[PDB]
Amino acid sequence: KATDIYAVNGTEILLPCTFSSAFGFEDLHFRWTYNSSDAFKILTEGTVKNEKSDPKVTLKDDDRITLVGSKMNNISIVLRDLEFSDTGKYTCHVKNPKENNLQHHATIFLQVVDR
Numbered sequence: 001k002a003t004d005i006y007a008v009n010g011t012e013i014l015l016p017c018t019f020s021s022a023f024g025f026e027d028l029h030f031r032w033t034y035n036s037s038d039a040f041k042i043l044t045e046g047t048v049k050n051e052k053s054d055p056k057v058t059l060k061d062d063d064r065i066t067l068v069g070s071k072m073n074n075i076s077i078v079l080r081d082l083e084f085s086d087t088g089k090y091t092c093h094v095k096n097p098k099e100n101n102l103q104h105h106a107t108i109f110l111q112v113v114d115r
Contacts, residue, residue: 004109012080015108017092019073024051029095030075032065035107036088043090044077079110087112 007013017030028048034041044065046057055067055075068076075094079086092105 002106006111006113007082009082009084009112009114011082012078013082014076014078015090016076017105019094021051025096026050026098031093032077033091034088082112084112
C-alpha cells in the first residue's frame with residue numbers, strides 16, 4: 001500500500017523495491033521515478049539479464065543515488081545527502097517484456113524533516 005517514510009535532512013534513506021518471479025525471468029527492465037506537483041524525474045533505470053544476474057544501470061540522473069548490492073531480487077536505491085526538495089513520491093516500476101507484464105510497486109511518499 002502507499003507508504004510514508006520519514007528521513008532527516010542531510011541523512012540517507014533506502015527506498016525498497018523487491019521483485020520475485022515464480023519461475024525466473026529474462027531481460028527485466030526497471031525504472032525509479034520521482035513525482036511532485038510540479039516536477040517529474042526519471043531517477044534511474046536499468047536491466048537485469050536473468051534471476052541470477054546483478055542489475056545493470058543504464059540511466060542515473062542524480063549522483064546521490066546508488067543501487068543496494070546483492071539476494072538477487074533487489075533494485076532498492078539509497079538516496080544520500082537528503083534535501084528539503086527530496087520530499088515527494090518515489091515509485092519503482094518493473095517491466096517484463098517477454099511476459100508483457102508491468103508491475104508498479106506502491107508509491108513511497110518520502111518526507112524529509114528538519115524538526
